[PDB]
Amino acid sequence: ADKLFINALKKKFEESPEEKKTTFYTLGGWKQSERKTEFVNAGKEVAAKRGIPQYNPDIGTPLGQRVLMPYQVSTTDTYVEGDDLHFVNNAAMQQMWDDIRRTVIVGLNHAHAVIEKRLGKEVTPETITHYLETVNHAMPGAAVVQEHMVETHPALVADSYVKVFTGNDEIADEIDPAFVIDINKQFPEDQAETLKAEVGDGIWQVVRIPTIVSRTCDGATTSRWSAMQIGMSMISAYKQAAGEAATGDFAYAAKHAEVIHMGTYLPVRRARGENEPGGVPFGYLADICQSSRVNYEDPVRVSLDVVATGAMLYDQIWLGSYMSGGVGFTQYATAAYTDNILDDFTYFGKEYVEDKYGLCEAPNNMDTVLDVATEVTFYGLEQYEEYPALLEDQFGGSQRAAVVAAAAGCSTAFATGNAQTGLSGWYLSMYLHKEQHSRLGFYGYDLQDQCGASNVFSIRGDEGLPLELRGPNYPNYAMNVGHQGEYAGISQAPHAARGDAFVFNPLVKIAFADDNLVFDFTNVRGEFAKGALREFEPAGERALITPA
Amino acid sequence: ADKLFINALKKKFEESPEEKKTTFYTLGGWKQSERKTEFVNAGKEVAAKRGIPQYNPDIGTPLGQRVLMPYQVSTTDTYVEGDDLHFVNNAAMQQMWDDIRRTVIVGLNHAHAVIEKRLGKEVTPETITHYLETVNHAMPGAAVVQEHMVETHPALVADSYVKVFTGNDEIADEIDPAFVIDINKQFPEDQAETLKAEVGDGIWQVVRIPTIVSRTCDGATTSRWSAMQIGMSMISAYKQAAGEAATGDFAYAAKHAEVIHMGTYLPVRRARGENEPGGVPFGYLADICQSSRVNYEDPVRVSLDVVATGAMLYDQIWLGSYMSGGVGFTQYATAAYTDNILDDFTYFGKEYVEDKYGLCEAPNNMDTVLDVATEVTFYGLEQYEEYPALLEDQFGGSQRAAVVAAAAGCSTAFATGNAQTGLSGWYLSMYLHKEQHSRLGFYGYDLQDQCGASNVFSIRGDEGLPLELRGPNYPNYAMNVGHQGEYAGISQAPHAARGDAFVFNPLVKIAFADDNLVFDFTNVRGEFAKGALREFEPAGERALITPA
Amino acid sequence: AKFEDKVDLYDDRGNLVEEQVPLEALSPLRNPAIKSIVQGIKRTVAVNLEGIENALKTAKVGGPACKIMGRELDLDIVGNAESIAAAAKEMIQVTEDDDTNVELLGGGKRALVQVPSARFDVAAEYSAAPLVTATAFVQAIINEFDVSMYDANMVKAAVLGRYPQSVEYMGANIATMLDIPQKLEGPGYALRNIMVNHVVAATLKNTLQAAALSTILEQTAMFEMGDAVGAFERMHLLGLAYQGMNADNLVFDLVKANGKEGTVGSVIADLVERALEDGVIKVEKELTDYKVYGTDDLAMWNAYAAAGLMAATMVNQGAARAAQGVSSTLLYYNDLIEFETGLPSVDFGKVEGTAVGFSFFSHSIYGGGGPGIFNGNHIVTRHSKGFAIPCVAAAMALDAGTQMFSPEATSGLIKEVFSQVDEFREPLKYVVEAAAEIKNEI
Amino acid sequence: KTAKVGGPACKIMGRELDLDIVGNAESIAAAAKEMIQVTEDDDTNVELLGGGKRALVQVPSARFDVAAEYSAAPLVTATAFVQAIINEFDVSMYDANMVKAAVLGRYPQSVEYMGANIATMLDIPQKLEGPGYALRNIMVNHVVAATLKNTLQAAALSTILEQTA
Amino acid sequence: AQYYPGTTKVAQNRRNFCNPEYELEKLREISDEDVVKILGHRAPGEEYPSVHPPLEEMDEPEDAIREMVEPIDGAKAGDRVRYIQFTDSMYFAPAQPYVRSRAYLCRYRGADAGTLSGRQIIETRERDLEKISKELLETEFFDPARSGVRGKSVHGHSLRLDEDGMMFDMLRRQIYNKDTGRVEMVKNQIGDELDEPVDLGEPLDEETLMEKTTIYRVDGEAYRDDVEAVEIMQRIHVLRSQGGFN
Ligand code: F43
Ligand SMILES: C[C@@H](OP(=O)(O)O)[C@H](NC(=O)/C=C/CCCCSSCCS(=O)(=O)O)C(=O)O
Ligand SMILES: [Mg+2]
Ligand SMILES: [Mg+2]
Ligand SMILES: [Mg+2]
Ligand SMILES: [Mg+2]
Ligand SMILES: [Mg+2]
Ligand SMILES: [Mg+2]
Ligand SMILES: [Zn+2]
């Protein structure tokens, strides 16, 4: 059958994708593009309004001496200019990040113990449900105890709420389903039994603070905001004195002893608090993406939905804004989630491994890394050499390095069932690719790549870690595009081939199994398309409090 | 003439302001309030649409057993319920913080040295204008060198731009005036001469990145995004190779050697990067406020516009959200910018000082601290005792302590011309107030207050600092409401009485003298009223990219 | 001697040990036992061999609720502890007869490790203790079981956690009384970032020894921070002696006189009587039925008032056998004494201020917690320069079981290992002995 | 003399203090040495350079064997010079905080000693990328300056500090 | 001990509340059962819940300080730590927030007292808390119109009185009976309805409020005219200032 990228290449160019020559310089530059033309017109309107020049197509070099391409968002039939995938222009991408940044998971297990032991009071499904009606009033920023409080406008904060989950079916089934992430409904039966066994009789809150607050403030706000309003709702629903010594144990539990941040804080050169992208480990990113609980019969679809989640967050928002800015890094990321290119390569590798070894049944060793990562690296590279339109599509070496090595590293982990030999296959792919084409990525692309083989299995202080625990703050990974989202995909790959319900943290997996999110985490690439088409509705906007 | 708060007390309550008795419990609770009624209805609508209970006026205790008051925004004739002054419900308050967070000051001094001495090219006003045209295309997120770049939509990022200033009038006048903050146009003559003397022949950029990016990301994004696009524009405008060794000197200059952040980064317990509220020192906050260049005839107006800037940012957004959250701290801050109360107290103290000493005439010593701060403390406290409506208005002791001590500390510094003795008068105020009424503030209000007298003039490592250099990260100040914005007013007070153009950084002062900002920093209290009325138009919205 | 003051030193039963010791013999800069304690605290690590084994067997590594399915490794670490510990020790030591100690506890479920002092004399700071210990145990476990290159990274995760993705050793199965250098609120703060529950657990809840260890650590940090240099030095040394070292048996005798029926106010009255009897304070002025006291020695008044503050904590929270009211004692002992006398309270108001915020952040929704989770580096309790946290240590030593976040809950690993060390457990005894030894060298 | 304290371009008008510190460098240095030392004749060194414009200060080793880390060097130095400057001129209680600012900068509002007029080859412990990294946070130009650009000696000093870390 | 400077009635009342030798005037009689009901921590005839076992059952190591300090009775028993909280009107209630915490730590053993503008709390072991609470409720610490027992929703210290002379209470826990001239407690301190109300007696008339108040006000005795008490506050400020410097 056609390679999976052929439909997209036929849409991009007039030539068939195998054709070797074209013509350039006749398209009228920016005037070929609907989107560029909208930008030129907007630039002139902005500059007049504010009295300062702004976007001008005659500054610098003239874009569009070649075709300015559409991109197919992979797994969709949506084709858009790449500007519609820039995070600034795509409200689904912004919301995906806000939904992560404004979430925290907070236990009720120490809290319920403080109530039974220090206060000497009972906890039951009934007193939990009362507590959850109270905290769902308080959490968006409304009052429960003092007189003369002034509050947030409910409609500005309609995306903030608190749910719970537990492995104890009999407590879960008895609370108002309005408040419960129901593991049995949300997960197929095998995955539900694994998750309920991990959670056991623990009861956990998933707290989402308002998107308008997260945007005004930062990620480190989230666990504090959550704890203030859990603390108020504990006082109101359990009849404490409104501020006694025991109140401090609820605060320490909700802020530190039974909190799970999405991201941990960063070192001073890149200083940031909790719940910022650099603190999110790759294992968590894979668990936030919900493809695993929908697409589990297709480990390649689960893995590549994780790569799309991570490439957009880590490369476009984190590296391309928090850590840089400007035009930024849209197409370093879109290479991993458009034109079905990574999908073609990775489905090739999956078939290779399923035929040769069977999924997860290759030895977990360097012989398997050498076999699978080299075979899938040469397949992907051969496609750029057989299809000159594919090479002109993924025109930057770094894009090609990330895509070919993601397919090689994922397929290696589909063979071994272990992410660490997957990571070794990613690095081997880079070294083979560099020698095949006498280039790899941008000037600084392979800092991690050359440290890479040696640090995969090291045990030393700031070198050794399973891939699932690494993240954007692992030292070698802290700077460069075209790696972090792909590493999240590799972390997912052996778990998806094994049928595991989660990669690194079961609580995180359950916490995003929730259709009350604004972004739909079960279909990340579908959401990116919806945002690109201007059809996604984000939270956080101020229209209600601004003039008509 | 009447005390300046009388009109407001006559608006709030049916009784005359001196009347000791009233009747409660007859107002229908929340039904007395237009805003609570809007909230009840919106909570019903939110909960029905999403399937989770939200705002409910019957959870916890029933607001409005007493009058839910309007508040006059001081210096205005706008009266609003306090919920309209919560930062979540007030787009002017959110934009004030976005305009600070998204600003950096970046010299061109080292950069022009690199171009002359390393690249061997000339800099003149003309080459500076070409560079400014180029950076005003690139800074909002648009390309100047590469082919096939995808860019931000210019209308989503219309608030981002770069201007410059210099103390050389003839050089300022040669650069295109679209790009120039004209010191002589924005500042009265004497202040303009002071500011141009400080800047000299130095040339500085004021860079503002897009509010939509600041909101998506964080304050530590600002100097990075600025430097990326300065770097691209130096490449394009001075014909560099696009990435050569000298490119890294422009990066180190723009990111480190000649950058001025609005805020410095914070320690790990409260981890945050640069350009977050806790890093903004009090002298910079007084400089950001632009009342000094407009209201210079009236040092009380200048000082209390700085107290409003700081009480909102430091107590409502910083302490009440970044550092806690929930319903938060609206009225802890509104006590310092409503009902003309702090104005009444501080005009009294200014007049007392005028008469006894003359502004700036008093000896800079403890005798002056004891005279002025005691006299003004007793004045303020007598007002609450003479007017039962005033005490029921500023019903929390912390609100009263902050307002009386701000008037006492500002008045002391109007006498001495020195903010340190002003600060000692703030602490003495708290000690007198505590013994007068046998109460001060909330449980934790006077941690800094009891450390306070001893640390005013200490010289030890983490104790000794001139008030202008202190901020929300000075150790004793790092936790509690009702101090930080008032300290920014005390830091402004002696400089407004002296007629100094700035309090701590002349670059920061100039950098906000710009009507291209979205918030009008010359009239902070006026803008808070406009936002409360839902009449302020913020930047950053996603309407253009979301469904109609 | 730079100062002429002498003090009498006692044991924790109130018996005299040594009379007329020069004040500087208690200085952290001179006392060799405080040097040993501080170098001990920098170099000692608790290793939880059982916890490493269990984390490997379940693949639960990297922090709370984290687990990597398919990565499980079942290794008989505790049953081979002796061999693992010996192989770790040969990598940890510098030479064979140096001061490295590696000692199994709990049937090999735990190890006390003291990394050799010499590694610290050529280090900038103190992180060599956990980092040298961690790698030596990761390498000794890999070598004991010949763990493969493919699986060894799980041993590293079980020992040291999610570092370096996380800044801290998140999920580690080792523990130290110090915390990482990046968490200091300022430079010079490391000896202050030691949980109060860790000091109470190391001293086995002996009230005087907990207060001594806490004071030694706090006032030694005051030297490192520069606060005790120049004008302030004597004030800090006298605080150390009288509040933490029971100099002249002042704390002890106040507690004895007020323990059966006393309150904070009765302790105050006794301390003001004692300060007058000793000439530390004198009536300066008579107002109407009210004596205004003055002093010609503010450092000594501050020290006497500090001893009274400690005694008041012991009386007040000792009578409740509940630590929470220490925040109230630290506030109202100092508020009452300034209106009782006309003189400044302990640390010139900074204990009272620390106590106002400590009270709020131990009885409110916003942060903090119970007394035992504070420390001198905590934002709420950093403000007094050594005169508040030792009282919190005494109070948690006297708590009979009212805390959820008790030393049993937060500091069990620390208690098993660090209470083994005689100078950490009974510092009052070793510092006073060393002071008596060097008494003629000052 | 200019009230330029607290970091780049910062100034507090009205706070200027005109003190002849360089002309009295010997008395100030000796008074700071007496606070900095532990005992007379220990390994404390305070040496004037550049006719009193600079001082080389080596804080006694003994203060580090009773410290967790290395910040006692700048903190003990800074406070002994702040107190010696105040005592030399009898700076008043009201003005002395400007001496503090001119020495140590905007600390503690800033985490670093931002605008300080003292310098070390080490940087603050908070800036370490990982535990154990302090001997790595020494600028290459500082190594090359201290070794007077002798190629082998700069390579040696850098390797000693790297491999010791 | 001298407690407090000053030559006003307010000063002398501050010293009398602090002085354990001063006999607090008893104004009203309340039964033990009714103190327990107003506290709201346990029901009549419910045994004291424990947070830990009795001290005697613990077998503790030798500690000289523990040996010297006698535990209060509820500490020996292992009782929960519970609280009582009061709000005092700035319209001349007899006790006020710092007066309470200062007095409690001179009068009562084993006490965690907290002061705020709108509420003041003591937490201690439950059986001892019931003994101290009887004294806080039956004596001139308390006026049933100008002071309120309130564990939450404390607003009213700074509010105008209603037409009966009662302080505002969002939850109306104390109701003035026009037919008796007496106040009844109708709810416990957290706001739950009592089965039967508790007699709290008659509010103090204005003369006796003025005699017994510890707040300074322009319309009572002004603090600025108690020049000796201001002098000691100012002294404190100046001495802490100079001590912090050198
Ligand atoms: C539960 C606490 C203890 C705690 O840690 N925080 C609370 C409650 C918290 C909640 C109350 C929201 C709610 O009702 O659900 C919030 C808004 C913080 C948040 N979580 O959003 C808050 N306080 Ni409080 N808190 C305030 C105040 C106060 C004053 C109120 C005295 C009075 O007589 O009314 C007193 C402290 C004092 O006595 O000085 C106070 C206490 C308390 N404060 C007592 C509850 C008091 C009561 O039972 O009624 N606050 C104030 O004094 C004014 C500003 C006000 C803050 C809201 C705003 O700034 O708009 C609010 C700030
Ligand atoms: C103290 C510390 O919290 P931690 O102990 O959990 O680290 C720190 N939190 C804070 O400093 C909290 C400051 C903001 C909230 C308190 C401001 S005082 S205004 C409320 C008074 S009252 O209305 O409740 O009486 C943090 O880093 O989160
Ligand atoms: Mg949906
Ligand atoms: Mg949808
Ligand atoms: Mg007069
Ligand atoms: Mg305008
Ligand atoms: Mg007499
Ligand atoms: Mg009776
Ligand atoms: Zn943001």
Query: Which structural domains are found in chain C, ordered by start?
Result: 1-43+191-442 (1.20.840.10), 44-190 (3.30.70.470)
Residue C42 CA to residue A128 CA, distance in Å, equals 45
* Amino acid identity for residue D124 in this structure: I
Q: Which helix (H) or strand (E) holds A435?
A: helix A419-437
Residue D19 CA to residue D21 CA, distance in Å, equals 6
Asked if C77 contacts C141 with a C-beta cutoff of 8 angstroms, the reply is: yes
Q: For this structure, is C366 an active site residue?
A: yes
First to last CA, chain E: 30
In terms of Cβ atoms closer than 10 Å to its own Cβ (0-12, 13-18, 19+), residue D162 is exposed
**Cα within 13 Å of Cα(C390), Cβ side:** 32
Strand partners, E112: E123
Which of A225, A244, A255, A274 to mutate to test ligand 2, by most ligand atoms within 8 A of the CB atom? A255
Q: Say if B457 is an interface residue toward chain D (CB within 8 Å).
A: yes
First to last CA, chain B: 53
3-state per-residue secondary structure call for B335-363: CCCECCHHHHHHHHHHHHHHHHCCCCCCC
Looking at the complex, report in whole angstroms how far the Cα of residue C64 sits from the nearest Cα belonging to chain E.
Answer: 28
Backbone angles phi, psi at D118, to 5 degrees: -130, 155
Residue E187 CA to residue E40 CA, distance in Å, equals 9
Q: Which residues of E touch D93 (CB under 8 A)?
A: 241-242, 245-246
Which residues have a Cβ under 8 Å from the Cβ of D97 and sit 6 or more positions away? B420, B457, B458, B459, B464, B465, B466
Neighbours of C (≥3 Cβ pairs closer than 8 A)? A, B, D, E
Asked if A282 contacts A468 with a C-beta cutoff of 8 angstroms, the reply is: yes
Peptide bond into D108 cis (omega under 30): yes
Nearest residue to B444 (alpha-carbon basis) of E90, E110, C365, E93: C365
B316 lines ligand 1 (CB under 6 A): no
Q: Beta-carbon neighbour count of residue C51 at 10 Å? A: 20
Cα B446 to ligand 5 centre (Å): 28
Residue C261 CA to residue C248 CA, distance in Å, equals 23
Q: Beta-carbon neighbour count of residue A351 at 10 Å? A: 12
Residue A52 CA to residue B277 CA, distance in Å, equals 29
* Amino acid identity for residue C19 in this structure: E
All structural domains of chain E with their residue ranges: 1-246
Q: Which residues of A touch D129 (CB under 8 A)?
A: 267, 269, 475
The sign of the CA dihedral A392, A398, A403, A404 is: positive
Q: Which residues of D touch A475 (CB under 8 A)?
A: 129-130
The sign of the CA dihedral C267, C272, C275, C280 is: positive
B480 lines ligand 2 (CB under 6 A): yes
Q: Which helix (H) or strand (E) holds C269?
A: helix C264-277
Cα C319-C320-C325 angle, rounded to 5 deg: 110
Angle at which helices C350-360 and B447-456 cross, to 10°: 160
C290 is in an annotated binding site: no
Backbone angles phi, psi at A403, to 5 degrees: -70, -50
Peptide bond into E203 cis (omega under 30): no
Backbone angles phi, psi at A337, to 5 degrees: -140, 15
Q: Which helix (H) or strand (E) holds B332?
A: helix B330-334
Residue C438 CA to residue C44 CA, distance in Å, equals 26
Asked if B306 contacts B488 with a C-beta cutoff of 8 angstroms, the reply is: yes
Nearest residue to B495 (alpha-carbon basis) of B276, B222, B299: B299
Asked if C101 contacts C112 with a C-beta cutoff of 8 angstroms, the reply is: yes
Strand partners, C403: none
Tokens of D137: 């946070």
Strand partners, A73: A338
Q: How far is CA C24 from the centre of its chain?
A: 21
Residues across chain D: 165
Q: Do B447 and C354 touch (CB under 8 A)?
A: yes
E contact set with A (CB within 8 A): 49, 51, 80-81, 83, 85, 112, 121, 123, 151-155, 170, 190, 192
Q: Which helix (H) or strand (E) holds A70?
A: strand A70-72
- Measured torsion, CA atoms of residues A493, A498, A501, A507, in degrees rounded to the nearest 10: -60
Nearest residue to A369 (alpha-carbon basis) of A316, A329, A321, A413: A413
* Amino acid identity for residue A41 in this structure: N
Catalytic residue set of A: 146, 332, 444, 480
Reported CATH class of domain E1-246: alpha beta
Instruction: Please report the resolution in angstroms.
Output: 1.4
Residue A372's alpha-carbon distances to A304, A353, C374, E193, in angstroms, are 18, 7, 53, 74
Q: Which residues of A fall in the annotated binding site?
A: 146, 224, 255-256, 269, 332, 443
* 3-state DSSP assignment of residue E124: strand
Q: Which domains are present in chain B?
A: 2-100 (3.90.390.10), 101-275 (3.30.70.470), 276-535 (1.20.840.10)
Residue B139 CA to residue C125 CA, distance in Å, equals 43
Which residues have a Cβ under 8 Å from the Cβ of B423 and sit 6 or more positions away? B409, B413, B452, B456, B467, B487, B490
Tokens of B15: 């009784």
Cα A519 to ligand 4 centre (Å): 6
**Count helices and strands in chain B by DSSP H and E runs:** 24, 6
Q: Which residues of A fall in the annotated binding site for coenzyme M?
A: 332, 443
- Measured torsion, CA atoms of residues C166, C167, C173, C175, in degrees rounded to the nearest 10: -160
Structure-determination technique: X-ray
Q: Which residues of C touch E110 (CB under 8 A)?
A: 316-317, 319-322, 325
Residue C252 CA to residue C318 CA, distance in Å, equals 13
Q: Which residues of B fall in the annotated binding site?
A: 146, 224, 255-256, 269, 332, 443
Asked if A353 contacts A359 with a C-beta cutoff of 8 angstroms, the reply is: yes
Residue E98 CA to residue E92 CA, distance in Å, equals 14
* 3-state DSSP assignment of residue A141: coil
Tokens of D152: 């082998």
First to last CA, chain D: 41
First to last CA, chain C: 5
- Ligand that comes closest to the CA of residue B514: 6
Cα A516 to ligand 4 centre (Å): 10
Q: Beta-carbon neighbour count of residue A476 at 10 Å? A: 18
Asked if A291 contacts A330 with a C-beta cutoff of 8 angstroms, the reply is: no
Q: Say if A235 is an interface residue toward chain C (CB within 8 Å).
A: yes
Residue A467 CA to residue C61 CA, distance in Å, equals 12
Cα B436-B440-B441 angle, rounded to 5 deg: 165
Strand ranges for E56-119 from DSSP E: 81-88, 112-115
State which residues have CB under 5 angstroms from ligand 6, the bound ion: B 515, 520
Residue A48 CA to residue A42 CA, distance in Å, equals 10
Name all contacts of A16-25 with Cβ < 8 Å and 24+ positions apart. Answer: A16/A389, A17/A387, A17/A388, A17/A389, A17/A390, A18/A386, A18/A387, A18/A388, A18/A389, A19/A388, A19/A389, A20/A388, A24/A65, A24/A66, A25/A65
Residues 265-294 of B with CB under 8 A from D: 265-268, 279, 281, 283
Asked if D30 contacts D130 with a C-beta cutoff of 8 angstroms, the reply is: no
Residue B95 CA to residue B313 CA, distance in Å, equals 11
> DSSP label at E192?
P
Asked if B427 contacts B452 with a C-beta cutoff of 8 angstroms, the reply is: yes
Nearest residue to C214 (alpha-carbon basis) of C184, C234, C244: C244
Backbone angles phi, psi at B21, to 5 degrees: -125, 150
Tokens of A505: 């943290």
Q: Which residues of B touch E238 (CB under 8 A)?
A: 366, 370, 453
Residue B393's alpha-carbon distances to A105, B404, C306, E156, E223, in angstroms, are 39, 14, 41, 11, 23
Residue C142 CA to residue A458 CA, distance in Å, equals 12
Q: In A20-90, which ranges are continuous DSSP H helix?
A: 34-50
Q: Do C164 and A504 touch (CB under 8 A)?
A: no
Residue A373's alpha-carbon distances to A415, A431, A477, in angstroms, are 10, 11, 21
Nearest residue to D119 (alpha-carbon basis) of D74, D60, D53: D74
3-state per-residue secondary structure call for chain D: CCCCCCCCCCCCCCCCCCCCCCCCHHHHHHHHHHHHCCCCCCCCEEEEECCCCEEEEECCHHHHHCCCCCCHHHHHHHHHHHHHHHHHHCCCCCCHHHHHHHHHCCCCCCCCCCCCCCCCCCCCHHHCCCCCCHHHCCCHHHHHHHCCCCHHHHHHHHHHHHHHC
Residue A150 CA to residue A526 CA, distance in Å, equals 40
Residue B470 CA to residue B483 CA, distance in Å, equals 12
Looking at the complex, report in whole angstroms how far the Cα of residue E243 sits from the nearest Cα belonging to chain D.
Answer: 10
Nearest residue to E200 (alpha-carbon basis) of E187, E190, E191, E219: E187
B399 lines ligand 1 (CB under 6 A): yes
Residue B324 CA to residue A444 CA, distance in Å, equals 40
Cα E117 to ligand 1 centre (Å): 11
Angle at which helices C128-145 and C81-92 cross, to 10°: 130
Cα B512-B518-B521 angle, rounded to 5 deg: 40
Asked if A162 contacts A205 with a C-beta cutoff of 8 angstroms, the reply is: yes
Asked if A208 contacts A161 with a C-beta cutoff of 8 angstroms, the reply is: yes
Tokens of B22: 């009233």
Looking at the complex, report in whole angstroms how far the Cα of residue D129 sits from the nearest Cα belonging to chain A.
Answer: 6
Q: Which helix (H) or strand (E) holds B128?
A: helix B125-138
Residue with tokens 């103090």: E204
First to last CA, chain A: 54
Q: Which helix (H) or strand (E) holds A282?
A: helix A282-288
Asked if D165 contacts D136 with a C-beta cutoff of 8 angstroms, the reply is: yes
Residue C12 CA to residue C286 CA, distance in Å, equals 40
The sign of the CA dihedral B515, B519, B520, B521 is: negative
- From C150, C293, C366, C430, the catalytic residue: C366
Looking at the complex, report in whole angstroms how far the Cα of residue E241 sits from the nearest Cα belonging to chain D.
Answer: 9
- Ligand that comes closest to the CA of residue A515: 3
Residue A247's alpha-carbon distances to A230, A238, A257, B223, C363, in angstroms, are 11, 11, 14, 40, 6
